[PDB]
Coordinates of N, CA and C in Angstrom, one line a residue:
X974 N 7.2 -3.1 -31.3 CA 8.6 -1.8 -30.6 C 7.6 -0.8 -30.5
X975 N 7.9 0.0 -31.2 CA 7.3 1.6 -30.6 C 5.8 2.1 -31.2
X976 N 4.7 2.2 -30.6 CA 3.6 2.2 -31.6 C 2.9 2.5 -30.4
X977 N 1.3 3.2 -30.5 CA 0.5 3.7 -29.8 C 0.1 2.2 -28.9
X978 N -0.6 2.4 -27.7 CA -1.0 1.6 -26.8 C -2.0 1.0 -27.5
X979 N -1.7 -0.6 -27.5 CA -2.5 -1.7 -28.1 C -4.2 -2.0 -27.4
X980 N -4.0 -1.6 -26.6 CA -5.5 -1.5 -25.5 C -6.9 -1.1 -26.2
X981 N -6.7 0.1 -26.9 CA -7.8 0.7 -27.2 C -9.1 1.0 -26.8
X982 N -10.3 1.3 -27.2 CA -11.6 1.5 -26.7 C -12.3 0.9 -27.6
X983 N -12.6 -0.4 -27.8 CA -13.3 -1.1 -28.9 C -14.7 -1.1 -28.4
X984 N -15.9 -1.2 -29.7 CA -17.4 -1.1 -29.3 C -17.6 -2.3 -28.1
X985 N -18.5 -1.7 -27.6 CA -19.1 -2.9 -26.9 C -20.2 -3.6 -27.4
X986 N -20.3 -5.0 -27.3 CA -21.0 -5.8 -27.6 C -22.5 -5.9 -27.1
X987 N -23.6 -6.3 -27.6 CA -24.8 -6.3 -26.6 C -24.8 -7.5 -26.1
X988 N -24.0 -7.6 -24.8 CA -23.9 -8.8 -23.9 C -25.7 -9.5 -23.4
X989 N -25.8 -10.6 -23.8 CA -27.2 -11.3 -23.6 C -26.8 -13.0 -23.0
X990 N -26.4 -13.9 -24.2 CA -26.2 -15.0 -23.7 C -25.0 -15.4 -22.7
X991 N -25.3 -15.3 -21.9 CA -24.2 -15.7 -20.6 C -23.7 -17.1 -20.6
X992 N -22.9 -17.6 -21.7 CA -22.4 -19.2 -21.8 C -21.3 -19.2 -20.8
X993 N -20.2 -19.1 -21.2 CA -18.6 -19.1 -20.8 C -17.8 -17.6 -21.0
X994 N -17.1 -17.6 -20.3 CA -16.1 -16.5 -20.4 C -14.4 -17.0 -20.5
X995 N -13.8 -16.0 -21.1 CA -12.4 -15.9 -21.1 C -11.5 -15.1 -20.3
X996 N -10.3 -15.3 -19.7 CA -9.3 -14.6 -18.9 C -8.1 -14.4 -19.6
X997 N -7.7 -13.7 -19.1 CA -6.2 -13.2 -19.2 C -5.1 -13.0 -18.2
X998 N -4.0 -13.4 -18.0 CA -2.8 -13.0 -17.0 C -1.8 -12.7 -17.7
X999 N -1.4 -11.1 -17.2 CA -0.2 -10.8 -17.7 C 1.0 -11.0 -17.2
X1000 N 1.7 -11.3 -17.8 CA 3.3 -11.4 -17.3 C 4.2 -10.0 -16.9
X1001 N 5.4 -10.3 -16.6 CA 6.4 -9.2 -16.2 C 7.2 -9.6 -17.2
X1002 N 7.7 -10.7 -17.9 CA 8.5 -10.7 -18.7 C 8.2 -12.3 -19.6
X1003 N 8.8 -12.7 -20.3 CA 8.6 -13.9 -20.9 C 8.9 -15.0 -19.7
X1004 N 8.2 -16.5 -20.2 CA 8.1 -17.6 -19.1 C 8.7 -18.6 -20.0
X1005 N 9.0 -19.7 -19.2 CA 9.6 -20.8 -19.5 C 8.5 -21.9 -20.6
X1006 N 7.2 -21.9 -19.9 CA 5.8 -23.0 -20.7 C 4.8 -22.6 -19.7
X1007 N 3.5 -22.8 -20.0 CA 2.4 -22.8 -19.3 C 2.8 -23.6 -17.9
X1008 N 3.7 -24.4 -17.6 CA 4.2 -25.1 -16.3 C 4.3 -23.7 -15.3
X1009 N 4.9 -22.6 -15.7 CA 5.1 -21.5 -15.3 C 3.5 -21.3 -14.3
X1010 N 2.6 -20.6 -15.2 CA 1.2 -20.0 -15.0 C 0.6 -21.1 -14.1
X1011 N 0.8 -22.7 -14.5 CA -0.1 -23.8 -13.9 C 0.6 -23.8 -12.4
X1012 N 1.8 -24.0 -11.8 CA 2.6 -23.8 -10.7 C 1.9 -22.4 -10.0
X1013 N 2.0 -21.4 -10.5 CA 1.6 -20.1 -9.7 C 0.0 -20.3 -9.5
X1014 N -0.8 -20.5 -10.3 CA -2.4 -20.6 -10.1 C -2.4 -21.7 -9.0
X1015 N -1.9 -22.8 -9.0 CA -2.0 -24.0 -7.9 C -1.5 -23.5 -6.5
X1016 N -1.0 -22.2 -6.4 CA -0.4 -21.8 -5.2 C -1.2 -20.6 -4.8
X1017 N -1.9 -20.1 -5.8 CA -3.0 -19.0 -5.7 C -4.7 -19.5 -5.5
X1018 N -4.8 -20.7 -6.1 CA -6.4 -21.1 -6.0 C -6.4 -22.7 -5.6
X1019 N -7.3 -23.0 -5.2 CA -7.8 -24.1 -4.7 C -7.4 -25.2 -6.3
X1020 N -7.4 -26.9 -5.7 CA -7.4 -27.8 -6.7 C -8.5 -27.9 -7.4
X1021 N -9.8 -27.5 -6.7 CA -11.1 -27.7 -7.2 C -11.4 -26.5 -8.2
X1022 N -11.0 -25.3 -7.6 CA -11.1 -24.3 -8.4 C -10.2 -24.4 -9.8
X1023 N -9.0 -24.5 -9.7 CA -8.0 -24.3 -10.8 C -8.3 -25.1 -11.8
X1024 N -9.3 -26.5 -11.3 CA -9.5 -27.5 -12.5 C -10.6 -26.9 -13.6
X1025 N -11.4 -25.6 -13.1 CA -12.1 -25.3 -14.0 C -11.6 -24.7 -15.2
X1026 N -9.9 -24.2 -15.0 CA -9.4 -23.5 -15.9 C -9.2 -24.4 -17.2
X1027 N -9.5 -24.2 -18.6 CA -9.6 -25.1 -19.8 C -9.1 -24.2 -20.9
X1028 N -8.6 -24.8 -22.0 CA -7.8 -23.9 -22.7 C -6.7 -23.2 -22.6
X1029 N -5.8 -23.5 -22.0 CA -4.9 -22.5 -21.3 C -3.9 -22.6 -22.6
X1030 N -3.6 -21.3 -23.4 CA -3.1 -21.4 -24.3 C -2.0 -19.9 -23.8
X1031 N -0.7 -20.2 -24.6 CA 0.2 -19.1 -24.3 C -0.1 -17.9 -25.4
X1032 N -0.2 -16.8 -25.1 CA -1.1 -15.6 -25.8 C 0.6 -15.5 -26.8
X1033 N 0.0 -14.4 -28.0 CA 1.2 -14.4 -29.1 C 2.1 -13.1 -28.4
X1034 N 3.2 -13.4 -28.1 CA 4.2 -12.9 -27.5 C 5.0 -13.4 -25.9
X1035 N 4.3 -14.8 -25.8 CA 4.9 -15.1 -24.5 C 4.5 -14.3 -23.3
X1036 N 4.1 -13.2 -23.3 CA 3.8 -12.2 -22.0 C 2.8 -12.4 -21.3
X1037 N 2.2 -13.8 -21.1 CA 0.7 -14.0 -20.6 C 0.2 -14.8 -21.2
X1038 N -0.9 -15.5 -20.6 CA -1.7 -16.7 -20.9 C -3.3 -16.2 -21.1
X1039 N -4.1 -16.8 -21.8 CA -5.5 -17.0 -22.0 C -6.1 -18.4 -21.9
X1040 N -7.1 -18.5 -21.4 CA -7.9 -19.8 -20.8 C -9.4 -19.4 -20.7
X1041 N -10.3 -20.3 -20.6 CA -11.3 -20.4 -20.2 C -12.0 -20.6 -19.1
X1042 N -13.2 -20.3 -18.3 CA -13.7 -21.0 -17.0 C -15.3 -20.3 -16.7
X1043 N -16.1 -21.1 -16.3 CA -17.2 -20.7 -15.9 C -17.6 -19.3 -15.5
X1044 N -18.6 -18.7 -15.8 CA -19.3 -17.4 -15.1 C -19.4 -17.6 -14.0
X1045 N -19.5 -18.3 -13.2 CA -19.4 -18.7 -11.6 C -18.1 -18.4 -11.2
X1046 N -17.3 -19.5 -11.2 CA -15.9 -19.4 -11.2 C -14.8 -17.8 -11.1
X1047 N -15.8 -17.2 -12.4 CA -14.9 -15.9 -13.0 C -14.7 -14.9 -11.8
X1048 N -16.0 -14.7 -11.0 CA -15.7 -13.7 -10.1 C -15.1 -14.6 -8.9
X1049 N -15.3 -15.7 -8.3 CA -14.5 -15.9 -7.5 C -12.9 -16.1 -7.7
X1050 N -12.4 -16.3 -9.1 CA -11.0 -16.2 -9.3 C -10.6 -15.0 -9.3
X1051 N -11.7 -14.1 -9.5 CA -10.8 -12.7 -9.5 C -10.8 -12.1 -8.1
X1052 N -11.6 -12.5 -7.0 CA -11.4 -12.4 -5.7 C -10.2 -12.9 -5.3
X1053 N -10.1 -14.1 -5.5 CA -9.0 -14.8 -5.0 C -7.5 -14.7 -5.4
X1054 N -7.5 -13.4 -6.5 CA -6.3 -13.4 -7.3 C -5.9 -11.9 -6.2
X1055 N -5.0 -12.3 -5.6 CA -3.9 -11.4 -4.5 C -2.6 -12.1 -4.7
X1056 N -1.7 -11.4 -3.6 CA -0.3 -11.6 -3.4 C 0.6 -12.3 -4.6
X1057 N 0.4 -12.0 -5.8 CA 1.2 -12.1 -6.8 C 1.3 -10.9 -7.6
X1058 N 2.4 -10.8 -8.2 CA 2.7 -9.8 -9.4 C 2.0 -9.4 -10.8
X1059 N 1.2 -10.8 -11.1 CA 0.5 -10.8 -12.7 C -0.9 -10.1 -12.1
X1060 N -1.0 -9.7 -13.3 CA -2.1 -8.8 -13.4 C -3.2 -9.6 -14.3
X1061 N -4.7 -9.6 -13.4 CA -5.9 -11.0 -14.0 C -6.6 -9.7 -14.8
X1062 N -7.2 -10.1 -15.9 CA -8.4 -9.4 -16.4 C -9.2 -10.4 -17.3
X1063 N -10.7 -10.1 -17.8 CA -11.7 -10.4 -18.5 C -11.7 -9.5 -19.4
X1064 N -11.4 -9.6 -20.8 CA -11.7 -9.0 -21.9 C -13.0 -9.4 -22.4
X1065 N -13.4 -8.7 -23.7 CA -14.6 -9.3 -24.3 C -14.9 -10.6 -24.9

């Protein structure tokens, strides 16, 4: 409802073991199901690259998605993201 911004400034962990990385995609409003996100991603990413997306789940609030990708494709994904209203981030 009406609270202070949820983002905050949490403590930075000692990054070391570069294994996998998680991604987030914020929506404008609610969506139908993951099909919305998948259809969009398929129109903004290549079949080859989009296949790296795993564990795509609906965020708590249906206002975006959360998924995992390799640390290599993570930068390509970030650069290839354009021409869409959705915001792309990579949290801790």
